[PDB]
């Protein structure tokens, strides 16, 4: 019977603005959508899609609402089907080693859901790409845009696409007739980092009656 009355919902933190995407971003880049001061509407997450694969790395999935944190770093990427479990801190792989890696101390949670129809089409959408190699393993939370042809030999090919001189992007081979292991899911992640700030992003609270 305790009174928990609070002011109005204020301004929705725009998330579905990101999740309800017309076209998501390739892993080659990141949406990196910064969400500023508002009420962290994380609560509304179950109504994404059937078989929403969710699993966190430091915050209670359900009691996340009350834990107000400082800021949020939100980015998205569609990924090759089976590679969902590649997105995990301290787990090496293909994408996790040359596309995007989560630091071990990443307190946030990982959200993934199947895409299928929206992404995959019978004609084939080769728009999305992914990295093929690099001079060295990327530092975590870093963005690579260079389209430089690799130097696998003792000789810099400069601008000729040659033996041991490779191009760093191949497309997401996405045909709807592909298997569940190959079906494109949509994997996003939300950073819950701590800083020196008044924690301008908190979950909303319910209210009682008069």
């Amino acid at each position: 019977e305790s009174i928990v009355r609070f002011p109005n919902i204020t301004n929705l933190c725009p998330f579905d603005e990101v999740f309800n995407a017309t076209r998501f971003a390739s892993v080659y880049a990141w949406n990196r959508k910064r969400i500023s001061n508002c009420v962290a509407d994380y609560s509304v997450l179950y109504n994404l899609a059937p078989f929403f694969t969710f699993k966190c790395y430091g915050v209670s999935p359900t009691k996340l609402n009350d834990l107000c944190f400082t800021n949020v770093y939100a980015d998205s990427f569609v990924i090759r089907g089976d590679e969902v479990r590649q997105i995990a801190p301290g787990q090496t792989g293909n994408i996790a080693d040359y596309n995007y890696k989560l630091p071990d101390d990443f307190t946030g949670c990982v959200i993934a859901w199947n895409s299928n129809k929206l992404d995959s089409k019978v004609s084939g959408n080769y728009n999305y790409l992914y990295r093929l190699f690099r001079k060295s393993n990327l530092k975590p939370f870093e963005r690579d845009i260079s389209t430089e042809i690799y130097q696998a030999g003792n000789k810099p090919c400069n601008g000729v696409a040659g033996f041991n001189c490779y191009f760093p992007l191949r497309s997401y081979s996405f045909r709807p007739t592909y298997g569940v292991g190959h079906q494109p899911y949509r994997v996003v992640v939300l950073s819950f980092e701590l800083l020196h700030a008044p924690a301008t992003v908190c979950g909303p609270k319910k209210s009682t009656n008069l």
Partner: antibody
């Protein structure tokens, strides 16, 4: 160096399509490259193609381009080569030749080569 | 189109004596995308040249052939039993098709 295991020889009828298996023992072709080359007894190493295995981008020598196909098998790290429209004189040795690829650099020029597979079209 | 023709392959040569293997081509090509391979019969060839001379791992200064543009050669300073083998020059430039050479019969002068 290390030796790449290669599939056993067989004999086939004319007009068939042959799949010959070449797989490195402990060398996954992460960003490596390879493809096959053919000789008959005492003749030239007739080139076939090359693929960036990590990629899948192909080149088919514009000679048997309509009858030669290649795909890889990353899961077990095997490269493949199908030669359709097998006619008489294709009876010849097959070699799969790859360069060593350290994940950061490859020694320019294919050095790690396969065992050698015999293929006979004749009856 | 690339037609790279090799030297008068049929080399009847006495031990220790010098040899030269020209790999004249039909077109101008960078002097790095060509290598030489040595084959004992009944087994695949082996890598000898990496770029310019670039004597291969294990293979000493004995094989230091050169060339540029359309001219490319391989030189042998001495002769050892392993030297008596098929020699192959091959082009591997760019995404373009890799050209191969006919061969060279390095044998003993009798």
């Amino acid at each position: 160096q290390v030796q790449l295991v290669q599939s056993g020889p067989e004999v086939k009828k004319p007009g068939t399509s042959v799949k010959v298996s070449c797989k490195a023992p402990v060398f996954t072709f992460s960003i490596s490259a390879v493809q096959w080359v053919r000789q008959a007894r005492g003749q030239r190493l007739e080139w076939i193609g090359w693929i960036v295995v990590g990629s899948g981008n192909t080149n088919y020598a514009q000679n048997f381009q309509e009858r030669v196909t290649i795909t890889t098998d990353m899961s077990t790290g095997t490269v493949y080569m199908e030669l359709s429209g097998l006619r008489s004189e294709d009876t010849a040795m097959y070699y799969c030749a790859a360069p060593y690829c350290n994940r950061t650099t490859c020694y320019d020029g294919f050095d790690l080569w396969g065992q050698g597979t015999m293929v006979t079209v004749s009856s | 189109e690339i037609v790279l023709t090799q030297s008068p392959g049929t080399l009847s040569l006495s031990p220790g004596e010098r040899a030269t293997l020209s790999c004249r081509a039909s077109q101008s090509i960078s002097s790095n995308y060509l290598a030489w391979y040595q084959q004992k019969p009944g087994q695949a060839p082996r890598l000898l040249i990496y770029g310019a001379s670039s004597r291969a791992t294990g293979i000493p200064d004995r094989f230091s052939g050169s060339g540029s543009g359309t001219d490319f050669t391989l030189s042998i300073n001495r002769l050892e039993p392993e030297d008596f083998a098929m020699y192959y020059c091959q082009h591997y430039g760019g995404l373009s098709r890799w050209t191969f050479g006919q061969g060279t019969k390095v044998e003993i002068k009798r």
